[PDB]
Amino acid sequence: GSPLAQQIKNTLTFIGQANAAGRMDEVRTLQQNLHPLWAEYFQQTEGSGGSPLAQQIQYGHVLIHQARAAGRMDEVRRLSENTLQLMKEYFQQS
Ligand SMILES: C[C@@H](c1ccccc1)P(=O)(O)Oc1ccc2c(CS(=O)(=O)O)cc(=O)oc2c1
Ligand SMILES: [Zn+2]
Prior knowledge:
Blueprint: H1 3-20, H2 24-46, H3 52-70, H4 73-91
This protein binds the ligand C[C@@H](c1ccccc1)P(=O)(O)Oc1ccc2c(CS(=O)(=O)O)cc(=O)oc2c1 and zinc ion.
PDB class: de novo protein/hydrolase
Keywords: directed evolution, DE novo protein-hydrolase
Assembly: monomeric
């Protein structure tokens, strides 16, 4: 894949590994690492006409930022879980 796609894949794997161990501080760090990588990747795909599965992920990503900033902690938890799963499945299409 692209180098950026591999960076995202690796970072998703790390988030899953941290989640498995219950290391919530490391999950937070790794989600923050994912943030700029996904943002850049997504806009690259948009510059070449777009992917509906990518668009779906990004829609959820925006909703997550809106929920988190508003303190809507239940909506953040649900949306993060579902969107990170959509991204794992997307990048498993390799
Ligand atoms: C889950 C990630 C994602 C990444 C790509 C797609 C879908 C979800 P994300 O939403 O981008 O990851 C974050 C970002 C920021 C924070 C903050 C800091 S602030 O902006 O809230 O001040 C704090 C925090 O606890 O977690 C974050 C997670
Ligand atoms: Zn983000």
